[PDB]
Amino acid sequence: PYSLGPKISDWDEQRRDWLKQNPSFPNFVAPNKPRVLLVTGSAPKPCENPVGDHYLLKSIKNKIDYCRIHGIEIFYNMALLDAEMAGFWAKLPLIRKLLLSHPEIEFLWWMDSDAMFTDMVFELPWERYKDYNLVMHGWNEMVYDQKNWIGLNTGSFLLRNSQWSLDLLDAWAPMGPKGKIREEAGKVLTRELKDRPAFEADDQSAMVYLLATEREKWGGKVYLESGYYLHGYWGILVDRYEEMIENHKPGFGDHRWPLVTHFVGCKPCGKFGDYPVERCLRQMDRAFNFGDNQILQMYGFTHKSLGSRRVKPTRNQTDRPLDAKDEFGLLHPPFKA
Amino acid sequence: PYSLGPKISDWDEQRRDWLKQNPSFPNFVAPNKPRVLLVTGSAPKPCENPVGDHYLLKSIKNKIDYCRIHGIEIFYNMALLDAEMAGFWAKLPLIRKLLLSHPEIEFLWWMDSDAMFTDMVFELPWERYKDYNLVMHGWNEMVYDQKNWIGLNTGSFLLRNSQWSLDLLDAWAPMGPKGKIREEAGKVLTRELKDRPAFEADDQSAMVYLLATEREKWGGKVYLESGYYLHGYWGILVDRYEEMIENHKPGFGDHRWPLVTHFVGCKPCGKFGDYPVERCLRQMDRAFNFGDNQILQMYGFTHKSLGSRRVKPTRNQTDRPLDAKDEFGLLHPPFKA
Ligand SMILES: O=c1ccn([C@@H]2O[C@H](COP(=O)(O)OP(=O)(O)O)[C@@H](O)[C@H]2O)c(=O)[nH]1
Ligand SMILES: O=c1ccn([C@@H]2O[C@H](COP(=O)(O)OP(=O)(O)O)[C@@H](O)[C@H]2O)c(=O)[nH]1
Ligand SMILES: [Mn+2]
Ligand SMILES: [Mn+2]
């Protein structure tokens, strides 16, 4: 019987003591700003197609920029800590290890390598979640009623460092172990979830299954967010970037300017994805430039077009650089208090 | 005639004024701990050699881990801001833009992409540099006396945000502009420096030629460091890694445990390196694992060997994870208090 590790039950107490003992590492870096660690990663071998690694590189640059602006630290995992939890299931052993290793962390923000920040201004509404322990993009009707396997997304979610989350992880992991366990579990999810195709169990479908069946246990602390694109399906967003630049501005986080553009199904690191490789990579270039344009604007540059690697100036240089207007206040945002 | 931008002569005063008006953004984040921006980058296009991008990815994960531990921010540039200053010369326009855009930065730490942190414990001796503006690995006699084009290294150096540094940049760039200017300046360097081969002007040789021919003007603010491997030629280190693990411990930063292993001559991304690609990449794997071991060991894991991607546990799991602190106190170091 698979276990994520020795059962822990007094974690809230262990954390409470530690924080009291170690006031130099508070779990809140500011009145209403919890300490957040963004966690991402990739397999420890080169991508099967070679440009895959190049797009992992642009992906981590993109997260570096956002996290530098909004004052959150990054952990990039390149190791499998549990041979049975491979692939998308590898993030459960990782998350548990980081939560227990870093009690100063109040929120752990997992973000897939195929997910990219496209709104560099938007700051998560932390106070909205002060009473919750798990925040994922999704809809309650899709999860609890329709039991739709895409009722929520697990490529970009917040998990609070708490006893509730250690138990949540234990409840979530059973369908993960590679082999017969994951395969037979995939048959269950395909049968019990709406619109799910037939394939081995994935971490996302299992979360829908867990929350739909055991809602009384977990639902009270889960927040299914759909007011902004904590996760954003690329297939309906990337084509509208131009409309967004023309009618809106960064900071909305939603349909007007998505916080995250998540390239589900493109699999730039594998041999084949569920979509044309041409459209996947060109749209990943457009998404990367859509965000990078917000970085370069601070420094007086922009990409010639949304699909070009080349940049151009947006203004003449000056001998009075400190007089310049930072349009969105990202050079010295309040997130770096 | 080429210029890095409009002439600024009052930057030290502009900065002081800005800092007085923006106390929430100090240039010292703690007593004798300056605010540091580590800067790196790579060409915006995939690597000629395809697997080269996988090592750019490993290289930036390495820098993320060190900068997270030691409380240093990262900027990863992928844009060519100045068509004339292509190649290794591209860092001069970038460094100027960043210094001018971030007056809160006391020290900018440039780092080649093929340079990797192999001592995750070593913190730079900042006080040693309180009266200097440019810190590079090198030797006084080789640079000033012998005029040796390898008397210093410009792949890992600190540059203080100051009018002095802006002026140095003005003096350093002239041999840069691609074309007849760089190629002709290259023939001048080959003829005035010791043991320089024949190739286009390069920023390292140009820095030697400047400091040797204009010592009185520049030398008093340059610290040529050789007490630790701020830059560490891979050729004389990578074969000694297992010896270091047996005899020494992270924190020395020098011949016993180098801070930086820099793979000069390898060109894992480009082509036509001074060494065989296979030898280069395997040793970069070893360097990466050598550093990554220090990260994984905070969490109870290590690489089975410096040549294996697999990791193994260093200790059994526990239900009391806050009792045993890590061997080098890197989970909660003073750099993040
Ligand atoms: O061996 C692995 C496989 C995946 N991931 C991470 O888990 C996420 C989700 O895994 P998935 O198999 O769904 O790939 P995706 O289609 O989301 O890119 C990936 O994006 C990676 O960021 C990882 O860290 N190690
Ligand atoms: O187009 C470029 C080329 C290089 N660099 C950076 O400048 C350093 C030195 O460039 P070089 O041509 O010497 O390549 P190297 O042999 O050092 O890897 C690289 O490592 C990169 O970090 C960059 O930012 N943009
Ligand atoms: Mn994904
Ligand atoms: Mn180099």
XYZ file of C-alpha atoms and ligand atoms in Angstrom:
726
model
C 0.000 0.000 0.000
C 1.540 3.261 -1.202
C 2.129 6.089 1.274
C 3.583 9.562 0.816
C 5.406 9.093 4.126
C 4.993 8.560 7.867
C 1.565 9.758 8.963
C 1.709 13.183 10.612
C -1.197 14.528 12.667
C 0.026 17.498 14.769
C 1.426 19.515 11.863
C -0.537 22.653 12.742
C 1.020 22.415 16.206
C 4.532 21.716 14.902
C 4.234 24.727 12.584
C 2.857 26.949 15.351
C 5.771 26.093 17.648
C 8.398 26.488 14.917
C 7.151 29.931 13.882
C 7.127 31.058 17.515
C 10.660 29.679 17.900
C 11.886 31.216 14.616
C 10.417 34.728 14.302
C 13.091 35.593 11.716
C 11.053 33.538 9.196
C 7.413 34.617 9.543
C 4.727 32.957 7.448
C 3.439 36.413 6.415
C 5.924 38.821 4.822
C 3.481 41.728 5.190
C 0.077 42.522 6.768
C -1.994 40.749 4.092
C 0.744 39.009 2.067
C 1.529 35.370 2.921
C 4.933 33.910 2.180
C 4.577 32.078 -1.136
C 6.840 29.585 -2.906
C 6.129 28.983 -6.576
C 7.093 25.408 -7.483
C 7.590 24.068 -11.007
C 9.787 21.527 -12.734
C 10.491 19.193 -15.619
C 11.964 15.763 -16.264
C 15.732 15.466 -15.617
C 16.516 14.417 -19.194
C 16.593 16.382 -22.457
C 13.316 16.698 -24.321
C 12.660 14.099 -27.004
C 12.222 16.829 -29.562
C 15.122 19.242 -29.033
C 13.347 22.613 -29.108
C 11.389 21.311 -26.118
C 14.176 22.404 -23.784
C 14.296 25.864 -25.371
C 10.615 26.367 -24.504
C 11.212 25.112 -20.969
C 13.917 27.792 -20.771
C 11.575 30.560 -21.928
C 8.970 29.157 -19.533
C 11.230 29.515 -16.496
C 12.443 32.966 -17.566
C 8.785 33.990 -17.713
C 8.181 32.744 -14.164
C 11.430 34.370 -12.991
C 10.204 37.763 -14.206
C 6.764 37.514 -12.600
C 8.185 36.206 -9.329
C 10.861 38.901 -9.138
C 8.186 41.581 -9.562
C 5.672 40.089 -7.115
C 8.261 38.975 -4.552
C 7.805 35.202 -4.498
C 10.576 32.618 -4.537
C 10.973 29.835 -7.099
C 11.869 26.171 -6.730
C 12.583 24.277 -9.961
C 12.535 20.516 -9.400
C 14.504 18.197 -11.706
C 14.376 14.960 -9.716
C 11.969 12.080 -9.159
C 11.696 11.451 -5.414
C 9.237 8.547 -5.767
C 9.574 6.061 -8.621
C 5.862 5.194 -8.482
C 4.629 8.810 -8.771
C 6.012 9.638 -12.207
C 4.809 12.277 -14.635
C 2.093 14.660 -13.495
C 1.872 12.599 -10.288
C 5.447 13.551 -9.333
C 4.300 16.881 -7.880
C 2.599 15.266 -4.862
C 5.776 13.854 -3.243
C 7.541 17.114 -4.111
C 4.872 19.348 -2.568
C 4.780 17.332 0.659
C 8.569 17.525 0.995
C 8.654 21.297 0.471
C 5.749 21.968 2.844
C 7.431 19.989 5.632
C 10.924 21.310 4.872
C 9.733 24.950 4.827
C 7.286 25.653 7.670
C 7.802 29.375 7.030
C 5.879 28.872 3.766
C 2.197 29.727 4.100
C 1.177 29.012 0.488
C 2.749 26.694 -2.070
C 1.924 27.717 -5.649
C 2.416 24.809 -8.036
C 2.706 25.832 -11.685
C 3.205 23.486 -14.639
C 6.095 24.015 -17.048
C 3.556 24.388 -19.882
C 1.919 27.289 -17.989
C 3.152 30.840 -18.504
C 2.430 34.203 -16.875
C 0.733 36.576 -19.332
C -0.380 39.265 -16.841
C 2.687 40.610 -15.037
C 0.714 43.260 -13.097
C -2.022 41.099 -11.564
C -1.451 40.120 -7.924
C -3.353 37.178 -6.474
C -6.199 38.275 -4.127
C -4.718 36.661 -1.033
C -7.361 37.940 1.399
C -10.080 36.233 -0.657
C -8.451 32.910 0.307
C -7.718 33.619 3.991
C -10.274 30.968 5.052
C -9.376 28.347 2.425
C -6.559 25.831 2.018
C -6.697 24.845 -1.682
C -7.325 27.252 -4.567
C -7.725 25.939 -8.116
C -9.271 27.382 -11.252
C -12.629 25.778 -11.961
C -16.365 25.832 -11.352
C -18.339 24.186 -8.558
C -21.174 23.068 -10.842
C -18.656 21.404 -13.162
C -16.950 19.552 -10.295
C -19.678 18.707 -7.793
C -22.664 18.361 -10.152
C -21.536 17.496 -13.685
C -18.468 15.710 -12.262
C -16.733 16.942 -15.410
C -13.079 15.916 -15.507
C -12.110 19.453 -16.596
C -14.233 21.078 -13.882
C -10.929 22.245 -12.395
C -7.239 22.450 -13.262
C -4.204 21.231 -11.318
C -1.516 22.913 -13.431
C -1.712 26.116 -11.360
C -2.985 25.935 -7.778
C -2.287 27.168 -4.260
C -1.956 24.762 -1.332
C -1.772 26.037 2.238
C 0.879 24.598 4.553
C -1.438 22.893 7.035
C -2.550 19.553 8.422
C -5.537 19.779 6.066
C -3.159 19.730 3.092
C -1.064 16.800 4.343
C -4.299 14.810 4.626
C -5.538 16.149 1.283
C -2.309 14.882 -0.290
C -2.770 11.450 1.305
C -6.330 11.307 -0.046
C -5.207 12.412 -3.528
C -2.218 10.097 -4.106
C -3.803 6.589 -4.142
C -4.547 6.615 -7.893
C -1.019 7.753 -8.772
C 1.302 4.732 -8.457
C 2.425 3.741 -11.959
C 1.362 0.439 -13.502
C -1.788 -1.560 -12.807
C -2.846 0.853 -10.046
C -2.934 3.924 -12.290
C -4.381 2.016 -15.255
C -7.288 0.432 -13.375
C -7.840 3.797 -11.685
C -8.098 5.383 -15.130
C -10.946 3.007 -15.952
C -12.787 4.225 -12.842
C -12.324 7.915 -13.650
C -13.375 7.456 -17.283
C -16.489 5.638 -16.054
C -17.421 7.959 -13.168
C -16.510 11.329 -14.746
C -18.252 13.126 -17.595
C -16.458 13.666 -20.920
C -13.265 11.987 -19.692
C -11.477 9.940 -22.379
C -10.009 6.529 -21.600
C -6.442 6.677 -20.272
C -4.473 6.134 -17.082
C -5.477 8.173 -14.050
C -4.200 11.747 -13.965
C -3.843 14.003 -10.940
C -6.510 16.398 -12.240
C -9.268 13.818 -12.779
C -8.527 12.288 -9.370
C -9.044 15.672 -7.700
C -12.462 16.008 -9.357
C -13.305 12.470 -8.238
C -12.121 13.128 -4.679
C -14.019 16.409 -4.366
C -17.205 15.132 -6.026
C -17.521 12.044 -3.812
C -16.049 13.437 -0.564
C -17.313 17.021 -0.835
C -18.420 17.107 2.810
C -14.828 16.443 3.896
C -12.840 18.728 1.571
C -15.195 21.154 -0.169
C -15.393 23.616 2.710
C -11.713 24.550 2.367
C -11.465 24.289 -1.437
C -11.919 27.481 -3.459
C -12.742 26.913 -7.135
C -11.731 30.237 -8.672
C -13.155 31.415 -11.994
C -13.044 35.222 -11.717
C -9.541 35.376 -13.177
C -7.460 32.892 -15.173
C -5.404 31.328 -12.421
C -5.365 28.709 -15.158
C -6.119 29.714 -18.739
C -6.757 27.260 -21.559
C -4.567 28.447 -24.425
C -6.970 27.274 -27.132
C -9.391 30.171 -26.550
C -6.963 32.901 -25.393
C -3.865 33.093 -27.601
C -5.802 34.202 -30.690
C -7.219 37.210 -28.802
C -3.940 38.752 -27.578
C -4.196 41.486 -30.224
C -7.758 42.333 -29.178
C -6.491 42.558 -25.596
C -3.591 44.898 -26.419
C -6.022 47.119 -28.335
C -8.927 47.361 -25.865
C -7.432 46.617 -22.430
C -4.294 46.742 -20.296
C -2.442 44.426 -17.896
C -3.908 43.989 -14.435
C -7.313 42.412 -15.015
C -6.164 38.779 -14.902
C -9.335 37.518 -16.626
C -10.758 37.320 -20.169
C -9.437 40.858 -20.736
C -5.837 39.928 -19.867
C -5.277 36.381 -18.563
C -2.926 35.914 -15.634
C -1.908 32.463 -16.904
C -1.931 30.966 -20.395
C -1.655 27.189 -19.940
C -0.678 25.191 -23.034
C -2.520 22.022 -22.078
C -2.050 19.224 -24.594
C 0.823 20.819 -26.521
C 3.567 18.783 -24.774
C 6.521 20.716 -26.274
C 8.901 18.273 -24.536
C 7.463 15.035 -25.956
C 7.419 13.469 -29.398
C 3.731 14.167 -30.083
C 1.067 16.420 -28.607
C -2.700 16.597 -28.994
C -2.428 19.626 -31.318
C -0.430 20.725 -34.372
C 3.163 21.320 -33.305
C 3.307 24.400 -35.548
C 0.410 26.124 -33.787
C 1.602 25.043 -30.335
C 5.068 26.585 -30.622
C 4.066 29.730 -32.521
C 1.357 30.365 -29.926
C 3.833 29.676 -27.119
C 6.069 32.300 -28.740
C 3.157 34.751 -28.897
C 2.265 34.037 -25.266
C 5.868 34.468 -24.127
C 6.173 37.788 -25.966
C 2.785 38.912 -24.631
C 4.265 38.720 -21.133
C 7.820 39.712 -22.021
C 6.456 42.906 -23.602
C 5.321 43.892 -20.102
C 8.857 43.319 -18.789
C 10.662 45.121 -21.614
C 8.268 48.080 -21.361
C 9.875 48.929 -18.008
C 13.193 49.284 -19.864
C 12.029 51.062 -23.026
C 11.780 48.090 -25.402
C 9.140 45.881 -26.987
C 9.030 42.957 -29.378
C 8.725 44.089 -32.997
C 5.672 41.845 -33.275
C 4.043 39.257 -31.045
C 5.771 36.480 -33.013
C 9.253 38.006 -33.403
C 12.334 37.363 -31.291
C 13.656 40.818 -32.218
C 12.963 43.850 -30.039
C 12.823 47.581 -30.719
C 12.855 50.733 -28.581
C 9.644 52.403 -27.450
C 11.340 55.744 -26.673
C 14.651 57.540 -27.045
C 17.309 57.084 -24.389
C 17.832 59.912 -21.911
C 20.367 61.323 -19.491
C 17.448 61.620 -17.024
C 16.414 57.970 -16.609
C 14.776 58.519 -13.202
C 12.241 61.000 -14.627
C 10.684 58.345 -16.869
C 7.150 57.105 -16.247
C 6.978 53.386 -15.500
C 3.533 52.898 -16.998
C 2.411 50.079 -14.679
C 4.755 50.584 -11.716
C 6.575 47.266 -12.081
C 10.120 48.616 -11.650
C 9.395 49.333 -7.962
C 6.088 47.649 -7.131
C 4.767 47.482 -3.553
C 5.160 43.686 -3.684
C 8.844 44.324 -2.889
C 8.119 46.244 0.308
C 30.525 56.874 -33.580
C 29.075 54.266 -31.225
C 27.655 55.222 -27.833
C 25.919 53.264 -25.082
C 23.529 56.191 -24.635
C 23.261 59.862 -23.695
C 26.041 61.030 -21.407
C 25.168 61.043 -17.699
C 27.568 62.853 -15.360
C 25.537 63.223 -12.134
C 24.440 59.630 -11.535
C 25.869 59.397 -8.013
C 23.764 62.414 -7.013
C 20.648 61.236 -8.861
C 20.945 57.869 -7.100
C 21.416 59.360 -3.627
C 18.389 61.621 -4.100
C 16.287 58.724 -5.396
C 17.326 56.554 -2.446
C 16.470 59.271 0.081
C 13.006 59.579 -1.508
C 12.439 55.790 -1.715
C 13.565 54.352 1.636
C 11.367 51.286 1.081
C 13.884 50.321 -1.652
C 17.258 50.449 0.120
C 20.521 49.620 -1.617
C 21.554 47.644 1.483
C 19.117 44.922 2.546
C 20.983 44.432 5.856
C 24.197 45.631 7.564
C 27.020 45.186 5.026
C 24.711 43.080 2.804
C 24.197 45.056 -0.432
C 21.235 44.591 -2.712
C 22.450 42.411 -5.586
C 20.893 41.667 -8.965
C 22.400 38.596 -10.601
C 22.182 38.968 -14.388
C 22.563 36.272 -17.040
C 21.080 35.463 -20.425
C 21.238 33.578 -23.692
C 20.419 34.096 -27.345
C 16.645 34.292 -28.019
C 16.810 31.446 -30.561
C 17.132 27.680 -29.933
C 20.673 26.333 -29.756
C 22.458 25.366 -32.954
C 23.490 22.253 -31.045
C 20.006 21.104 -29.967
C 20.815 19.643 -26.529
C 22.531 22.925 -25.653
C 19.159 24.280 -24.529
C 18.828 21.513 -21.935
C 22.040 22.782 -20.327
C 20.884 26.394 -20.399
C 17.894 25.053 -18.463
C 20.065 23.193 -15.954
C 22.341 26.231 -15.680
C 19.506 28.584 -14.743
C 18.017 26.135 -12.227
C 21.457 26.145 -10.596
C 21.447 29.950 -10.399
C 17.877 29.979 -9.055
C 18.897 27.668 -6.211
C 21.944 29.718 -5.178
C 20.182 33.071 -5.505
C 17.200 31.792 -3.507
C 19.440 30.645 -0.645
C 21.493 33.852 -0.573
C 18.597 36.274 -1.140
C 19.668 37.530 -4.568
C 17.332 38.529 -7.397
C 17.786 37.218 -10.942
C 17.325 38.856 -14.327
C 17.554 36.505 -17.324
C 17.840 38.480 -20.560
C 16.971 37.009 -23.958
C 16.842 40.211 -26.045
C 19.517 41.769 -28.253
C 19.123 45.402 -27.185
C 21.757 46.708 -29.611
C 22.421 45.159 -33.023
C 25.977 46.525 -32.968
C 26.872 44.831 -29.661
C 26.093 41.236 -30.573
C 27.706 38.253 -28.894
C 29.558 38.525 -25.599
C 29.421 42.316 -26.046
C 25.640 42.251 -25.505
C 26.026 42.473 -21.717
C 27.315 46.073 -21.743
C 24.076 47.710 -23.004
C 22.063 45.373 -20.770
C 24.117 46.165 -17.660
C 23.817 49.912 -18.272
C 20.043 49.767 -18.763
C 19.632 47.751 -15.559
C 21.863 49.972 -13.417
C 20.004 53.073 -14.608
C 16.565 51.455 -14.233
C 17.230 50.028 -10.731
C 18.965 52.694 -8.613
C 18.253 50.472 -5.596
C 20.843 47.973 -6.887
C 24.220 48.415 -5.218
C 25.977 45.561 -7.061
C 25.097 43.978 -10.393
C 26.489 40.434 -10.612
C 26.930 39.340 -14.212
C 27.314 35.600 -14.756
C 27.959 33.677 -17.961
C 25.305 31.100 -18.769
C 28.038 28.426 -18.927
C 29.073 29.317 -15.351
C 27.585 27.298 -12.513
C 27.411 27.600 -8.733
C 29.240 24.644 -7.176
C 29.438 26.080 -3.629
C 25.900 26.784 -2.419
C 27.132 27.747 1.070
C 29.738 30.364 0.142
C 28.542 33.953 0.534
C 30.605 36.636 -1.162
C 32.825 38.748 1.176
C 31.049 42.028 0.484
C 32.911 44.099 3.094
C 36.187 43.291 1.318
C 34.777 45.311 -1.609
C 33.303 48.293 0.274
C 35.778 50.681 -1.410
C 35.829 49.063 -4.873
C 33.469 49.289 -7.840
C 34.585 46.408 -10.102
C 35.354 42.932 -8.753
C 36.674 40.265 -11.121
C 38.604 37.033 -10.745
C 42.161 37.668 -11.853
C 45.713 38.544 -10.910
C 47.338 41.974 -10.750
C 50.667 40.887 -12.240
C 49.144 38.975 -15.164
C 46.900 41.920 -16.070
C 49.021 44.988 -15.328
C 52.541 43.567 -15.786
C 52.238 40.723 -18.317
C 49.140 42.098 -20.106
C 47.871 38.519 -20.354
C 44.473 38.257 -22.040
C 43.530 35.626 -19.426
C 44.778 37.589 -16.408
C 41.131 38.200 -15.506
C 37.722 36.769 -16.367
C 34.586 38.737 -17.267
C 32.138 35.825 -17.024
C 31.383 36.403 -13.334
C 31.943 39.882 -11.917
C 30.399 42.493 -9.641
C 29.827 46.056 -10.854
C 28.722 48.738 -8.413
C 25.887 51.034 -9.478
C 27.830 54.290 -9.709
C 28.935 57.068 -12.028
C 32.329 55.339 -12.028
C 30.719 52.201 -13.473
C 28.862 54.135 -16.176
C 32.180 55.705 -17.171
C 33.971 52.352 -17.265
C 31.206 51.078 -19.550
C 31.807 54.040 -21.866
C 35.516 53.125 -21.923
C 34.915 49.373 -22.370
C 32.444 49.389 -25.299
C 34.547 51.008 -28.080
C 36.081 47.695 -29.227
C 32.627 46.097 -29.379
C 30.610 47.173 -32.435
C 30.328 44.190 -34.770
C 32.094 44.429 -38.114
C 35.211 46.343 -39.137
C 35.392 47.896 -35.661
C 35.533 44.661 -33.670
C 37.669 42.807 -36.225
C 40.226 45.628 -36.402
C 40.233 46.112 -32.627
C 40.869 42.370 -32.428
C 44.115 42.681 -34.374
C 45.127 45.432 -31.935
C 44.442 43.213 -28.913
C 46.267 40.187 -30.341
C 49.293 42.432 -30.903
C 49.300 44.186 -27.502
C 48.337 41.317 -25.156
C 50.344 38.260 -24.163
C 49.361 34.886 -25.646
C 46.147 36.109 -27.284
C 45.157 34.120 -30.400
C 43.774 35.877 -33.494
C 40.041 36.600 -33.422
C 37.510 39.424 -33.206
C 37.774 41.817 -30.281
C 36.317 40.343 -27.095
C 35.202 42.041 -23.900
C 37.620 40.105 -21.674
C 40.701 41.063 -23.695
C 39.333 44.597 -24.076
C 39.056 44.848 -20.283
C 42.667 43.689 -19.892
C 43.877 46.153 -22.528
C 42.006 48.957 -20.755
C 43.152 48.242 -17.194
C 46.766 47.679 -18.263
C 46.991 50.820 -20.426
C 45.056 53.102 -18.041
C 45.777 51.781 -14.548
C 45.979 55.159 -12.785
C 42.474 56.101 -13.952
C 40.766 52.755 -13.301
C 42.920 50.479 -11.157
C 42.239 51.979 -7.734
C 38.595 50.870 -7.874
C 39.241 47.411 -9.392
C 39.580 44.424 -7.062
C 41.225 41.482 -8.841
C 40.175 38.548 -6.670
C 42.016 35.229 -6.477
C 41.201 33.932 -2.976
C 38.162 32.016 -4.193
C 36.726 30.901 -7.529
C 34.441 33.778 -8.360
C 35.396 32.312 -11.731
C 36.737 28.764 -11.845
C 38.195 27.276 -15.012
C 36.446 23.929 -15.397
C 39.577 22.256 -16.760
C 41.312 22.207 -13.365
C 38.270 21.458 -11.168
C 35.779 18.969 -12.630
C 38.127 15.990 -12.265
C 38.667 16.790 -8.558
C 35.021 16.825 -7.435
C 34.969 13.441 -5.693
C 38.228 14.331 -3.934
C 36.582 17.482 -2.553
C 33.567 15.506 -1.317
C 35.931 13.239 0.638
C 38.333 15.830 2.066
C 36.426 19.115 2.345
C 32.974 20.683 2.658
C 30.984 23.449 0.946
C 31.782 26.942 2.174
C 35.413 27.385 1.159
C 34.669 28.618 -2.366
C 38.294 28.059 -3.429
C 40.465 25.089 -4.477
C 38.782 22.978 -1.777
C 35.238 23.681 -3.048
C 34.958 26.189 -5.908
C 32.168 28.752 -5.901
C 31.891 28.843 -9.708
C 32.814 26.251 -12.321
C 32.956 28.109 -15.646
C 33.045 26.009 -18.820
C 35.045 28.395 -20.989
C 35.823 26.968 -24.413
C 32.976 24.441 -24.449
C 30.183 26.192 -26.390
C 27.499 23.621 -25.484
C 24.934 25.793 -27.298
C 26.860 27.300 -30.205
C 29.520 25.251 -31.983
C 33.252 25.118 -32.704
C 34.335 24.938 -29.085
C 37.927 24.559 -27.976
C 37.098 21.098 -26.582
C 35.094 18.008 -27.572
C 31.382 18.503 -26.961
C 31.031 15.079 -25.328
C 33.710 15.731 -22.701
C 32.193 19.172 -22.076
C 28.603 18.030 -21.564
C 29.457 15.103 -19.283
C 31.542 17.341 -17.024
C 28.728 19.914 -16.994
C 26.469 17.084 -15.816
C 28.971 16.399 -13.029
C 29.240 20.086 -12.113
C 25.448 20.423 -12.023
C 25.063 17.352 -9.802
C 27.955 18.548 -7.634
C 26.023 21.732 -6.901
C 22.585 20.100 -6.915
C 23.708 17.613 -4.248
C 23.965 20.529 -1.814
C 20.368 21.507 -2.643
C 18.934 17.984 -2.535
C 20.597 17.248 0.804
C 18.510 19.858 2.634
C 15.531 17.649 1.722
C 17.061 14.232 2.413
C 18.244 13.263 -1.075
C 21.406 13.074 -3.157
C 22.482 11.962 -6.605
C 23.576 8.326 -6.713
C 26.751 9.748 -8.268
C 27.939 12.907 -9.978
C 27.172 11.132 -13.274
C 23.646 9.887 -12.470
C 20.357 11.753 -12.817
C 18.766 9.364 -10.316
C 18.590 10.510 -6.706
C 18.537 8.397 -3.568
C 17.444 9.199 -0.009
C 20.084 10.184 2.526
C 17.843 9.358 5.509
C 14.565 7.602 6.233
C 11.364 9.624 6.315
C 10.195 10.961 9.669
C 7.000 12.216 11.290
C 9.030 14.860 13.190
C 10.596 16.796 10.305
C 11.459 19.959 12.288
C 13.880 18.325 14.746
C 16.893 17.757 12.458
C 18.163 20.917 10.797
C 20.236 20.498 7.653
C 23.987 19.946 7.817
C 24.752 23.487 6.574
C 21.683 25.474 7.662
C 20.613 26.388 4.131
C 16.875 25.825 4.630
C 16.777 28.933 6.850
C 20.075 30.789 6.399
C 20.845 34.302 7.685
C 20.691 35.664 4.118
C 16.874 35.407 4.339
C 16.276 36.562 7.935
O 8.847 14.013 -14.799
C 8.207 15.011 -14.670
C 6.966 15.221 -15.485
C 6.170 16.465 -15.320
N 6.595 17.490 -14.369
C 5.889 18.602 -14.211
O 4.363 18.255 -14.005
C 3.715 19.012 -14.852
C 2.500 18.289 -15.345
O 2.889 17.053 -15.881
P 2.210 16.562 -17.319
O 2.512 15.098 -17.549
O 0.712 16.785 -17.263
O 2.853 17.454 -18.559
P 2.152 18.821 -19.181
O 1.267 18.430 -20.346
O 1.335 19.509 -18.105
O 3.222 19.771 -19.704
C 4.764 19.283 -16.078
O 4.385 20.421 -16.855
C 5.932 19.495 -15.474
O 6.058 20.911 -15.084
C 7.824 17.279 -13.561
O 8.164 18.099 -12.795
N 8.631 16.021 -13.725
O 23.471 36.704 -27.549
C 23.927 36.553 -26.458
C 25.219 35.816 -26.291
C 25.793 35.626 -24.938
N 25.101 36.150 -23.761
C 25.617 35.981 -22.551
O 27.125 36.448 -22.526
C 27.820 35.415 -22.116
C 29.114 35.349 -22.874
O 28.863 35.171 -24.244
P 29.894 34.188 -25.106
O 29.843 34.548 -26.576
O 31.303 34.390 -24.600
O 29.459 32.601 -24.891
P 30.126 31.590 -23.755
O 31.294 30.842 -24.360
O 30.616 32.398 -22.562
O 29.088 30.586 -23.293
C 26.893 34.098 -22.416
O 27.261 33.011 -21.568
C 25.648 34.485 -22.155
O 25.367 34.324 -20.718
C 23.819 36.884 -23.925
O 23.264 37.309 -22.982
N 23.236 37.080 -25.298
Mn 0.286 21.474 -17.898
Mn 31.475 31.785 -20.351
